[model samples]
Target chain A: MEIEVKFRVNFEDIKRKIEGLGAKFFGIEEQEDVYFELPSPKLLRVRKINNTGKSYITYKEILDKRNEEFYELEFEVQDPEGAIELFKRLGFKVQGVVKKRRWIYKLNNVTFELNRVEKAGDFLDIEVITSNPEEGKKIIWDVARRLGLKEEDVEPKLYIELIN
Target chain B: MEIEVKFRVNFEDIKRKIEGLGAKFFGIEEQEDVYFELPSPKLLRVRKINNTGKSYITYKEILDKRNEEFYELEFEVQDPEGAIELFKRLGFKVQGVVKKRRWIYKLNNVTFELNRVEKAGDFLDIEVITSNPEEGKKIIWDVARRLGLKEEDVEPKLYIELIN
Candidate 1:
């Protein structure tokens, strides 16, 4: 299971705080995501990393909508365009595309995904992969508090939802 | 475009004929194909080559039913089981599975796929990937004639259809 929290933040301020906190910086990613139209609680999308020239197809079974907790199934694919075309041919409509430049950092088993989303505001995602959601959320909150993030800064909507 | 003709054959006999005719032998493939239930003229399937430990997802738009001509879009995937599970989650039913030990050989642009299917009998597929369907079929027939395959040897039905 994947658990995460999203927060709307001042990009540069949070970057400095994360760096000062001794988080390991894991380079940037230029991501282009194409989401297909699926019913609620189910997400189907293909993500292409432009900087790395790699692609992945992901399926998420959304468990907790507000907290952004989900069971995810994903695998690498050789051709992102072909996968999109296949879905289109099968009568699935393209919902929308989300493009972002993401800066990644890690500290104490928590992953920080800072995104400068196109048209959407800057956001930070503190994520953890664990079997225990309660424990994972506690760890996420501890990290978020240390980074000066508060409940008022929380942005519960997904990137796809925020774009619309 | 992909074009193919299927024929019922004595496995060992045709294998020897293909070898005697100087066809280049490509190694054997233990293929397990899981076909999803989609409407006619559209096919969605995942093929796993157990020998090479590779998997591919293929989508075909069947243009000609009699000759088995189609426009194919395929790409390698890292996880076959995950792909299958994703399709199932999206409400696609597994129509059937066709497992075969296939011997592949190529001679002068015409490729031969001799398959010993699990439940069905042995069959040979003469395939050509080309833009010109008519010309490709001519080459396939010419090679078929050289292999002493007669008109009565033709088995026009697909393996999936034959199994049903």
Candidate 2:
């Protein structure tokens, strides 16, 4: 399970705040995400990370209406083109693409992803991977507070949703 | 494109014939294939090769009624269990499982797969991967004749079909 919260933010401002909090910086990634068309609550996507030359196919089931909790399954794929072609052959149309430049940081057990999403503006994702959603959210909110983020800045929609 | 033909065969007899024909042997694979329930003509399956510790997710489109021609896309996957679970979460049921011990060989441009499919009997698949299906089929048939495979020996149904 993945517990996360998305917030609209100024990228540089949050990056400075996160760095000031003694978070370990983990470099940047150029990500191209291709989402497939599926019924509500079921999401399928193939992601290609250009900088690292790595690709992944992910299946995500939204566990809540807020899009904060998810049942996610992901695995590395050697051939992103082949995987995408296979999905197309299976009759799943390409729904949307979300491209971003993400800066990654970690503090405690939570991950902070500061993304400059293409055409969708800047955002920050405070995430934790844990079985206990309640505890995960607590940590996420704590991180949010340290960064001076409030509930009003929260964006419940997913990146794909915001773009499409 | 994959051009091939499946034939009912006596495993040892065909193995002897293939060896006599001077086909290069490529070792054996113990395969566990899990077929997912998808609509007609579109096939999705995950194959785990126990001997090699390799797994693949293959999506195949049966382009013809005889099932001899296919538009196939496949890629290696690290986690077969996670892949299957993701499929299940997407509401695709487990149609069936076909486990087999396969002997692999190749002669010229065509590959020979001799399978002892559990509960489905022994079979031989003469396959050629090429864009020119006509030439591919010609080579496949020539190899089939060299092995003394008759028209009546042809089994057009896939292994999953035979098992289910």
Candidate 3:
């Protein structure tokens, strides 16, 4: 499960602020995520991580209508190319693809992912992998303030939802 | 995404009938599934597989008001004990545990599971893992007819729902 908050921000300005805050910088990775269309309303995602060649399949659904918390399941795969073929055999079709370069950082028990999504532009995502949403939001707010952002500027939608 | 239809049936009777129909028996296992009580209406589940001792965490949300189909996510975990501890740290409390002896079989591309849940009693579940719920329901009905069970015997709620 993920309790997180997000905001669309200027890539350059947010980068400077995150660096200034003494956050540990992790290398950027170009990610290719394929969203499979299921017959039911549930969405399936197969993500291929760049540089490391690791892949993970994730299943996610909105738990409540008003809450931003998503019930998520992630499974690591040995071979992504082979796994995609397995999904094809299971009658799943690719609905869309998300291509992005994600810069990662960690500080104060929250992971900050700065993603420059193709077509969707830049976004800042603050997340805590926990069931307590209120505490997660408080951490997100604190991070946002450190990044010189306001609660009103945050966008509580997926990057995929914004573009496709 | 799997759309499974279930019914209340005599475990011994159904097992004999399933074998008579030339269904392949896949052995039996004593399974324990833990259901976590979330603060909201959404549900979370962790199922421990009996044979291999593997565990998987599942996230589920109801899709529609009238439909039994759920938006589900599943992730396999290396260590269930450690995972449960992590969930505890995140404020997710286990509400109850479901103990059952599950006899698994398959025939005509459909899997039949005869479960004798401790304290909850017996159930016969028929399912096909597919994207199509309507097609899944059709196969379930066909299997029900062969088992001499009617749709009216179907219990649409989860076993946990029945108890708590």
Candidate 4:
């Protein structure tokens, strides 16, 4: 399941604070999120290409601008061990992976992930849609505070967008 | 979970098909979706009035659009019998409820849904996000045929914008 917070923030201040939080961050990467038709509903998919697996998988859905369109997709994998293999059988090459630590958090339509390598016996993934820089920081701080963390607690790296 | 198929049909066509297919059709009432800031993140909430436990909750996040945004929130309760009391404690006052089967399918950029009660949960949902309706129809037909369905089996829906 994905839990997200969406709100406006002061761009410059949040940016500096976000770097302090220990969460993994990603800059602009996924450009478009095209939706498809299914029998009962529509499907939106991203084109992903992961070789190293380090930053191959991403979660950012669309760019932030104008009125801006954004969202966060949070769902738990019923089976973590078999997830990547299922993708591999469908021609997806193995890359990198991270396990989140808590109930994943998302902000400004951007969902933050806490990598878990314990307890749950599975990995979790989150995707946040950013429409602008301010929204991006809002997501970061929201993530930090939720985990009893601060801006300084977040990682100092910019993560990649989820594309497929 | 409650699944539905919303298509862009001529009002008359939809009425006829709903009757012919015997799909359990439920009319949607108006409600508001609230998004605000929180210390950890902004909140996503729904505000319903004179609604019920068994109604559809689909609306907008941050856009002035034509179509109602769609999604389902369900869980395996201890007893499906106490759903009314459960939602009440959970801030949901369900008035009436219905069930339909859902099938998986996809279109282009837009997500789609279909009601399973019409037949089984095997029905598919298809979508498109182009101004050109005719072209969208062709693509829908292509996907439907691949799945052994016909033009009559498809529902035509248009664009939905979700802003953060």
Every model's DockQ:
0.93, 0.78, 0.04, 0.02
Ordered by DockQ, highest first, the candidates read 1, 2, 3, 4
Tens digit of per-residue lDDT, candidate 4, span B41-64:
111222332243322222212221
Measured against the true chain A, the candidates' chain A TM-scores are 0.97, 0.97, 0.89, 0.29
Residue B130 accuracy (lDDT) in model 3: 68
Query: Tens digits of per-residue lDDT for model 3 on A1-164?
Result: 67777788999999999989999997888898888775433557778998777777666666655335777666665556654654554456887788899999988688889999997889888887656777777777877897889978788766656654
Per-candidate TM equals 0.97, 0.94, 0.51, 0.22
Candidate 4 residue spans exceeding 4 A from truth: A1-59, A62-71, A99-164, B1-164
Residue B159's lDDT in candidate 3:
78
Clash list (residue pairs), candidate 1: none
Q: Which stretches of candidate 2 lie over 4 Å from their true place?
A: none
lDDT of 2 by residue, B6-59 (tens): 999999999999999999999999999999988888889999999898998988
Instruction: Give lDDT per model, in order.
Output: 0.91, 0.91, 0.75, 0.33
Query: Could you give candidate 2's per-residue lDDT for residues A41-119 as a string of tens digits?
Result: 8899999999999998999889998999998899988888988887887778999999999999987688999999998
- Candidate maximizing TM-score: 1
lDDT of 1 by residue, A48-161 (tens): 999999999999878986857988999999999999998999899999999999999988789999999998989999998778999999999999999999989899888888
Give the least accurate 10-residue stretch of model 4 chain B, judged by summed lDDT. B35-44
Q: In CAPRI terms, where does candidate 2 land?
A: medium
